[PDB]
Write a protein that binds this ligand. Structure first.
Ligand SMILES: [Mg+2]
Ligand SMILES: [Mg+2]
Ligand SMILES: [Zn+2]
Lengths: 37, 93, 49, 120, 222, 38
């Protein structure tokens, strides 16, 4: 009766913050990731 | 009902767009015309603003076409001025 | 006014029924002939401009 | 899942049979549309409601004129199933300053520049 | 007199050894331990694999989706084994052994508490897929008899087809598709989103084109 | 509600039923029936 337990971790909100063409000041984070994309 | 009325160009509902609607309903006994009916004045104002929009859209489209013609001609003349810059001397003799 | 003509003026309603039946017959003969010649008589709508 | 429909672009390419069936001419295309709203935005998604509000078609059976350019053609392609598009053709010229009060729309899309109320 | 004709001779067909159907086991020899969800889209729409003939000339053609479990495999192999001629015919399985696990909770159980335990193994079959293929030095008629007899008892609709009958059916379906007289197809209305009709359709209906509905196949639909 | 795939033919939405009613195969009609012609 629910032998499996643990996978309740939420999403990391990682991805591209600034796409192509967006003006970016110095120090703005462009993309968050794991496992280099 | 009328959908035969559309084939004669007559706006299927006979109580709009005709002489049955747009003519004045009454007049005085000595011959003087009536003041204009209020729905007639509203329809005439709406027809005027529709025609104004038609004129404005056609003029904006023609002005856009003429400005694009001038942009193409000016770019082509500027590049033709760019082509002729030669004063060549290297392999001539 | 068609119902009021039906009740109070039956001669005018017989005239209207004769008109509708004649235009029906003209439409039928126009359907058999595609016109050619006359497109009837009680056809030929009056044109307003 | 239900999502917005992108349409293949081979739909909006007229065949010569289509040019014979309808009246249009592939050279000299018409300049203006006459769009009329003939189906409710209710029980349709919110993007179709927004496009209908943008184009100016809130009141049904009320004609509105637009340009014939690819941007408004994209907006009309989104809601082409709620409308009736017919070309504004002009029998006389487009209306001058003297005419403007005396004009009419005349279904069959003929913006007649002289509108009397007398028989021919 | 009555005109006799040359028979179709068979000197180009060699029957292989082991001409009868092999045994099909109930469960794979390595039992699967992780329960899989009910991916119902393996019985849905047209088949993409096992669609054309390989060795024989005769087949059972599936005309709708369905899951074959071990009872259907036993029925098919028993009937085709006992009703063929082993010295002139041979049959070939065109479906793999049943591999998809299906779990049932215990009898009379409340809802909740996780998935059940794996009981029995099935194999999905889509529409248009061939199921058994037969060949040999025989005609179409006798195998049409005992293959319609088998194909009646499958969980979906099925027919016994030959190469000629399948190719005739495909040409006739395409000729019906190009002879159509009303201008409104399901394809033209579905892909172009006429009438806003994509609200009541599926995203799968742009490829199914109205010929498919659930696990069912309507072969007159065009 | 039921799944997308069912066992019992799954009665359609009425707009889809109208769509499948209006797009049926219509066979070509010869002018004179071919046997009635020599
Ligand atoms: Mg997770
Ligand atoms: Mg969470
Ligand atoms: Zn006959």
């Amino acid at each position: 009766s629910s032998k499996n337990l643990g996978g309740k971790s939420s999403g990391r909100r990682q991805g591209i913050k600034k796409m192509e063409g967006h003006y970016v000041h110095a120090g703005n984070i462009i993309a968050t990731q794991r496992h280099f994309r | 009902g009328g959908q035969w009325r559309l084939q004669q160009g007559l706006a299927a509902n006979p109580s709009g767009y005709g002489p049955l609607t747009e003519l004045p309903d009454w007049s005085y006994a000595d011959g003087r015309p009536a003041p204009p009916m209020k729905g007639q004045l509203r329809r005439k104002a709406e027809r005027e603003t529709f025609a104004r929009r038609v004129v404005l859209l056609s003029q904006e489209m023609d002005a856009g076409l003429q400005a694009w013609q001038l942009r193409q001609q000016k770019l082509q003349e500027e590049q033709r001025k760019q082509e002729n810059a030669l004063k060549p001397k290297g392999a001539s003799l | 006014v068609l119902a009021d003509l039906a009740i109070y003026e039956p001669k005018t309603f017989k005239s209207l029924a004769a008109l509708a039946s004649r235009r029906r017959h003209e439409g039928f003969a126009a359907a058999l002939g595609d016109g050619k010649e006359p497109e009837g008589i009680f056809s030929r709508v009056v044109q307003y401009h | 899942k239900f999502t917005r429909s992108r349409i293949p672009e081979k739909v909006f390419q007229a065949s010569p049979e289509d040019h014979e069936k309808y009246g249009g001419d592939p050279q000299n295309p018409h300049k203006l549309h006459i769009v009329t709203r003939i189906k409710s935005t209710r029980r349709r998604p919110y993007w179709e409601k927004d496009i209908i509000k943008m184009l100016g078609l809130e009141k049904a059976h009320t004609p509105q004129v637009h340009k014939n350019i690819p941007s408004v053609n994209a907006k009309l392609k989104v809601v082409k199933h709620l409308i009736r598009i017919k070309p504004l053709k002009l029998p006389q010229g487009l209306p001058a300053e003297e005419n403007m009060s005396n004009t009419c729309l005349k279904s069959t899309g003929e913006l007649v520049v002289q509108w009397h109320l007398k028989p021919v | 007199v009555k005109t006799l004709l040359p028979v179709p001779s068979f000197e180009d067909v060699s029957i292989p050894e082991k001409p009868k159907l092999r045994f099909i086991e109930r469960a794979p020899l390595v039992p699967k331990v992780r329960r899989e969800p009910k991916n119902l889209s393996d019985i849905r729409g047209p088949s993409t694999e096992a669609t054309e003939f390989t060795e024989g000339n005769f087949a059972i053609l599936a005309l709708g989706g369905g899951y074959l479990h071990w009872g259907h495999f036993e029925m098919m192999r028993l009937t085709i084994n006992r009703s063929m001629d082993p010295k002139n015919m041979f049959a070939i399985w065109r479906v793999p052994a049943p591999f998809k696990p299906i779990t049932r909770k215990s009898v009379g159980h409340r809802m909740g508490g996780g998935k059940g335990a794996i009981d029995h193994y099935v194999t999905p079959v889509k529409a248009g897929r061939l199921v058994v293929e037969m060949g040999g030095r025989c005609e179409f008629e006798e195998v049409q008899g005992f293959l319609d007899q088998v194909a009646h008892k499958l969980p979906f609709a099925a027919k016994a087809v030959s190469r000629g009958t399948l190719e005739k059916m495909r040409k006739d379906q395409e000729e019906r598709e190009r002879n159509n007289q009303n201008p409104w197809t399901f394809e033209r209305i579905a892909t172009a989103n006429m009438l806003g009709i994509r609200k009541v359709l599926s995203p799968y209906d742009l490829t199914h084109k109205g010929k498919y509905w659930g696990k069912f196949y309507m072969p007159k639909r065009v | 509600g039921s799944k997308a795939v069912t066992r019992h033919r799954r009665v359609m939405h009425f707009q889809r039923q109208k769509l499948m009613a209006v797009t049926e195969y219509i066979p070509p009609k010869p002018a004179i029936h071919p046997s009635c012609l020599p």
